[PDB]
Design a protein around this nucleic acid. Sequence first.
RNA 1: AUAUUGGCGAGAGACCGAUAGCGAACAAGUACAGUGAUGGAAAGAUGAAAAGAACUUUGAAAAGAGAGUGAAAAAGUACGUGAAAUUGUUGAAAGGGAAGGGCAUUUGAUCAGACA
RNA 2: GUCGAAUUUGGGUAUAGGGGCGAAAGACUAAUCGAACCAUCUAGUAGCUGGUUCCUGCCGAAGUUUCCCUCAGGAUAGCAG
RNA 3: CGUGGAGGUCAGUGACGAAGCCUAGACCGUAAGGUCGGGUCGAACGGCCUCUAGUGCAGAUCUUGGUGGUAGUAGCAAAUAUUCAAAUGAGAACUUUGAAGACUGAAGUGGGGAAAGGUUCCACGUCAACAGCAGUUGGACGUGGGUUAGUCGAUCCUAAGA
RNA 4: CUAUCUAGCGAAACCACAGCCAAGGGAACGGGCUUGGCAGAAUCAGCGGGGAAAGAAGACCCUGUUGAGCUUGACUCUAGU
Lengths: 84, 154, 53, 119, 50, 125, 71, 52
Amino acid sequence: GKGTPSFGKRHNKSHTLCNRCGRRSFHVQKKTCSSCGYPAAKTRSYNWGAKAKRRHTTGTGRMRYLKHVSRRFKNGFQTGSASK
Amino acid sequence: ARYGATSTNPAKSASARGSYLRVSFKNTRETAQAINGWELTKAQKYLEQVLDHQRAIPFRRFNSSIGRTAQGKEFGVTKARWPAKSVKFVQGLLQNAAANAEAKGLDATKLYVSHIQVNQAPKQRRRTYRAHGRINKYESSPSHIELVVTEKEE
Amino acid sequence: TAADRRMVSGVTEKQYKKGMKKMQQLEKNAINTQIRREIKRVNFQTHYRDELL
Amino acid sequence: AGVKAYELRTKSKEQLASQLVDLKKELAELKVQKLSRPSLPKIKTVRKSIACVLTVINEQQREAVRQLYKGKKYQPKDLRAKKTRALRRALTKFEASQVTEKQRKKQIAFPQRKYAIKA
Amino acid sequence: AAQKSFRIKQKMAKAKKQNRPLPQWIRLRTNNTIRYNAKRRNWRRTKMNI
Amino acid sequence: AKQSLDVSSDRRKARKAYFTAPSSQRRVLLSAPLSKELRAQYGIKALPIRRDDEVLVVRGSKKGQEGKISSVYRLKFAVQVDKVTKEKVNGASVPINLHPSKLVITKLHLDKDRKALIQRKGGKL
Amino acid sequence: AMKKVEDGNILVFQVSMKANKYQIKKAVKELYEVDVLKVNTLVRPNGTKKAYVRLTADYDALDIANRIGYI
Amino acid sequence: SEKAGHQTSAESWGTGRAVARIPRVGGGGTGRSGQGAFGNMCRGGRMFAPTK
RNA sequence: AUAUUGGCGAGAGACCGAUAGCGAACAAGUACAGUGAUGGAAAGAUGAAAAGAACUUUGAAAAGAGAGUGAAAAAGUACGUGAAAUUGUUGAAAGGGAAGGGCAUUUGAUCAGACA
RNA sequence: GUCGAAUUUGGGUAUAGGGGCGAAAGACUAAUCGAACCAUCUAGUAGCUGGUUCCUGCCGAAGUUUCCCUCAGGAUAGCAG
RNA sequence: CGUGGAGGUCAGUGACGAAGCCUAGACCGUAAGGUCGGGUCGAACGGCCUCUAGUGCAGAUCUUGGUGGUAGUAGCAAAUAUUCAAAUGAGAACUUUGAAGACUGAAGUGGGGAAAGGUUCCACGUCAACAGCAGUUGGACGUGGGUUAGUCGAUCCUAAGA
RNA sequence: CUAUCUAGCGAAACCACAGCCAAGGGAACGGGCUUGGCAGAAUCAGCGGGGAAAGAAGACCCUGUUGAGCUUGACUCUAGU
Ligand SMILES: [Zn+2]
């Protein structure tokens, strides 16, 4: 049987957790991930997947440093001590 | 907590209620119509004879292909059943309406169950698993119950 | 005993029981929603073999 | 509520470094009483007090290393300016204001003069 | 498995801490639209794919 | 009418700039008028409300009930007054959430940085 | 864990995740001024680390637990 | 929005199934997967002649 | 001078008003499905204020009946108004292998106003 | 039916779409194979099928001529408003 | 004729109840539809002259949501089989103990493990849901506890190969 | 062991409205129309005559200025050599 009796032989994973995007896409035999190619330098992104860039672009995360750059521009990238 | 079309006065009445009870709707309806209009001392005697398999509950509306029996003769029907979960939930409200007619001061010697109706509660879903990988519903049919006993005036 | 942790921080022993019984029902209507709406397009397969003739 | 940073700039380096250990001793005893008493709200202030010490310790060592590199040609990349990467690779206001010796002789002889139209 | 790696034991320990109902003092705040813990997993229903 | 292009006449932009105001822009939102003695004594129309001001109610069903500001609950945009309350059927006496606009200030909790505040609003001693 | 304090000389601590059985044997020497026979270590299923340090036959575990203050 | 209703990747099921020939969202495990798309009769679809 | 459906900050509308408008007014690219690329929802409104029903009594309990709060529980966290399908009680009437409809009147019910 | 072998099988690894692999059936390639799955161009095109939302008033047809890879369709003349 | 919005006007209606909804109650119009009484209900909405359109549904094996008849019906029938007393309990064919009766029968219904799952292990509470009958029991719900290495594995080395 | 009867639990396909015939005419094989035969509530277990029963925009045939697999000395090219 190709259905229910052959779904019982599925106990060996072929993808594991990626280390740079943290989702089960890192293919073990190829040794490359498939949502963003992890041993590659640049992340995998395509303009035919316009929706699949909404889930991953700039803004879906903490933005630990970039969220302050717009405030630091307004004051003008000043430095030094503050005030009275 | 409003009730059905009770055409009696509230001053000599006492009422009870159950909501979202997980009895069958189609059996608690025919239980509630077996005792409609009766005296309270004779409905309580009758409803526990049902549990001892004498004097069945006459099924009138929801009675398609149920089995025929001989205990339906006293009602003039040939199809009757003895629903046990239904009478245990109607007995639990006749005992609650006969406890509110003591706290209101009425006499339990001449009460009669005047208005009694059931309704349909929101169903409770489950799944059943059919052949060739299909999924189908498996729902409960719960029921609200309202009940009003009243002193027999003239 | 973490039972007193409730009793100092809002919740009472009684308020937990009537609160969880509402809460365990607030998940009951939602799972009754999920079974009802999905039950139409859940038998809708793709590659059925038709073992006849 | 315990310490206050204006009363910690004054205290010298070895006075802070022994005050910080005295706060870590008090903090560790408070995580024992929390195991036996359900609420313990004092443990917020002791945990914000070793942060107030540590920001005063680091305040002094950044300052003392800055006058150690004062006026030198190269200071570390922790004391230079965190302007954006595009600004640091850009020309300085002397380098941008460099003109050739021919374009400098022209600006002193034929400058842009201002004028009007009526007489 | 039994002989497991550390970066799945670090993941099933987070799922242990997230296997908690709503705290009951949450439902008492001013504008509290939350009423139950809707991201709540159970090992019978939903396998986590880690 | 509106004349600068920095102010909005939008409904939605002005209710989002009210319901999500931070807890110090809610300080001026909860101002309260002074009675017709302090307006002759000091010389302001309104001050931002503060805890432990003695106050009087001019609107509502609790009209003409003196009290004292017990807590400025500037999260529900409400203030609470003690010596008036609501006796529950359980026996608890919860206080009432008033709004600072429906009050009037009778005795003022003077202070530094409020003595100076009245002076910059042209007030007196 | 009280059974390990009272029967044996085993003090049980929750240690930080980056400690490595020399930083625990030396911590209990520096914090509590005792001697440690042997440190054992497991990583609890709530993702924290638990260390069964063991005092050595002349230091007593009840006296150290009482000086700390968890009896 | 010119991409309103055209976010989904819906392909019509065909005719051998006993349901209409509108494009239908594919997948499973959500309530949406199976529903119609891309039309103006559909819920979640376009409008007819989107305003320009 | 020019381009700008991304970023940041503003102003606006003969635009949509929760099956609409972005997929998302809400812990929404969230839950969930797939080995994987990818697919991807549903889900807004008690009241001005929780004053979210103390107490009594029947029940093993949920609950019920009173009582009480409220302008109103014909607003009681299943909470604005709450349509239809479909359902229950009560009231009227009809009924020999369908029901319904058209013209005409008897009978019952019901409604009526210039002169009223 | 075969049951000591052209045996059965675990794990590792190799080959990926006009490509793989085939003791060869067009078989198998994740319930998909005489060319997988996913997203996009894409709202592909259709002389073909179904549907096409209020009332009243007045007038009211055609299946015929000619040409067309024309015959389930058009252009043109006709009738009609 | 009707509808969503726009300019104008009626110094229009409205918490002494606007819109909605219900009504084998009334009236007008050939009709599309308009007006009124009653009930409900609680915050906005109309007439008229013009402007504008995402403007009128019985159908599309229409779309989404909801509900029916069928129907208390089909059925809940493989894996040999259960019974007595007691205890707990509001409640016992089903939970616990005891007494019987039996089965798997050492390629086990036994004891362990590799994949895979991930807290299911274990105790104390508890039965709204789930366990397609039941439930006092539970792999369920609620709160916690629990996995200890110089020798056991990884780590180390190479295989086909990357 | 089912079916059957009871306690508990409790779905689905399908459904314009529905359900007694004979002849007639009719889209040329009516449950309804027309003329007759007639006809008494509610129903239970069977049963396979009928409902041109249900299943799926006929898999055969034809039409399409609709495709695809494959073949060769079809037309137009092409890697390679
Ligand atoms: Zn990745």
